[PDB]
Amino acid sequence: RPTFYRQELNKTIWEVPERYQNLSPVGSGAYGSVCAAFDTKTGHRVAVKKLSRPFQSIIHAKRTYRELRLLKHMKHENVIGLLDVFTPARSLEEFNDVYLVTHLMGADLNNIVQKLTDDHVQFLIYQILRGLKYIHSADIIHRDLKPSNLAVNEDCELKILDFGLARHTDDEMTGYVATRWYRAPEIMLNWMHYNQTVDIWSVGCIMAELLTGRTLFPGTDHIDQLKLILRLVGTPGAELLKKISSESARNYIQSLAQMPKMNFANVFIGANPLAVDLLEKMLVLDSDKRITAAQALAHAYFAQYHDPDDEPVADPYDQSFESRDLLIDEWKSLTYDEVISFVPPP
């Protein structure tokens, strides 16, 4: 066990191993607090998050376990990775606080989206799809891909962030808000059971915005956003209408006048024809028919970067716990086991 030291950072008591030095606050929220630090063992600048109230309810305790399970699994160049997890507790009986450590990320895709060449868009979207092939191979769905969740460094290298965090509230999804502009229509409106194809819709929205500099579907509310979507991709045919299980949602959609799919070459004026082709294969209303991440990596738009021998898949991820019912202290004991069993990366 390392030696820990204590200090108070903006009304919070932080107790961390000696290896972490020069702590300084970076952010706060309902989730907890974050500090930047220097890791003397590895030489990295790191971000350290102290969870707030990790075991205060069954829902909170299960969420803490979920976040730790997801972060411990992710071992890919284009996905956030866990550098360390620790607790000052010396036994399960005194276990209360959880600290998570990752690389310090500077800019997200907002902080750049600058003047992006088509070569920049190729490389950025290639890296998102390489990370998604990995995530999807483990049956993990992100559900919240947007520019603020994509970290980028000075060399244009990209990582996908935000796994296992608290679900977005109803009020966070209301009105003229980027928290909804990238969501697939079937999850925005609870049309049906969704699956991993929801993430490819988000990639299409991100790629369009990198090419134009403008939000693709900046709706002022759920219904305005759906109208913007159907104007571009067309109203649904009877094939897709069958698959909408909500009779109420089906009824509403049929109340709208029918519209054909627009010509994407006239929407994305001047863009690479191969980029236009890929956007048409991502932004398909029927999720059954969207291109997958593994398929999109092989599209000609990425010929400069595609290497099928360096696009790895994930180890299997057992998420049977998600359907399991447990008491607060049982979720907490499961979390404790995962803290003490952590093996740092090479």
- Binding residues for ATP, by number, are 26-34, 49
Helix 118-137 to helix 197-212 angle (10° resolution) is: 170
Stretch that binds Cl ion, among 84-92, 130-138, 200-208, 213-221 (CB under 5 A): 84-92
What is the pattern of x (binds Cl ion, CB under 5 A) and - over residues 9-38? --------xxx-------------------
If one counts every other C-beta atom within 10 angstroms of the C-beta of residue 105, the result is: 15
Task: Decide which of ligand LVD, Cl ion, none touches 163; Cβ closer than 5 to 8 Å per partner kind.
Answer: ligand LVD
**Residue 325 a catalytic site member:** no
**Residue from 147, 185, 204, 219 that binds Cl ion (CB under 5 A)?**
147
> Which secondary-structure segment (H or E) carries 236?
none
The C-alpha atoms of residue 148 and residue 109 are separated, in whole angstroms, by: 6
Among the listed ranges 22-30, 91-99, 159-167, 302-310, the one in contact with Cl ion (CB under 5 A) is: 91-99
Instruction: Quote the least distance from Cβ 16 to ligand LVD, whole Å.
Output: 12
Instruction: Kindly state whether residue 163 participates in binding ligand LVD, applying the rule CB under 6 A.
Output: yes
Residue pair 285/107 in contact by the 8 Å Cβ criterion: no
Give min distance, CB of 256 to ligand LVD, in A.
Answer: 37
Q: Is 344 in the site for Cl ion (CB under 5 A)?
A: no
39 binds, among ligand LVD, Cl ion, none (CB under 5 to 8 A by kind): none
The number of CA neighbours under 13 Å toward the Cβ of 161 is 17
Q: Binds 71, which of ligand LVD, Cl ion, none (CB < 5 to 8 A, cut-off by type)?
A: ligand LVD
178 binds, among Cl ion, ligand LVD, none (CB under 5 to 8 A by kind): Cl ion
Amino acid residing at 27: G
| First vs last C-alpha separation in the chain | 19
In order, the DSSP letters of 310-332 are S-PPPPP---GGGG----HHHHH
Burial environment of residue 308 by CB neighbours within 10 A (0 to 12, 13 to 18, 19 or more):
exposed
Residues between 285 and 314 that touch Cl ion (CB under 5 A): none
Residue 273 or 316 with smaller CB distance to Cl ion: 316
Residue 181 binding ligand LVD, by CB under 6 A: no
Considering only residues 59 to 78 of the shown chain, the ones binding ligand LVD according to CB under 6 A are 67, 71
Q: Per-residue DSSP letters for 21-72?
A: EEEEEEEEETTEEEEEEEETTT--EEEEEEESSTTSSHHHHHHHHHHHHHHH
Q: Which does residue 136 touch among Cl ion, ligand LVD, none (CB within 5 to 8 A, set by kind)?
A: none
Span near ligand LVD by CB under 6 A; candidates 112-120, 162-170, 216-224, 229-237? 162-170
User: Of residues 20-49, which lie at the interface with ligand LVD (CB under 6 A)?
Assistant: 34, 47-49
Burial (Cβ within 10 Å: 0-12, 13-18, ≥19) of residue 236 = buried
Nearest distance in Å: CB 116, Cl ion: 16
Residue of 162, 224, 277, 286 marked active site: 162
Q: Are 54 and 48 in contact (CB under 8 A)?
A: no
Q: What whole-number distance in Å separates Cα of residue 277 and Cα of residue 90?
A: 57
* Contact set with ligand LVD (CB under 6 A): 34, 47-49, 67, 71, 80, 100-102, 161-165
* Contact set with Cl ion (CB under 5 A): 2, 17-19, 87, 89, 96-97, 146-148, 178, 317-318
- Catalytic sites, residue numbers: 162
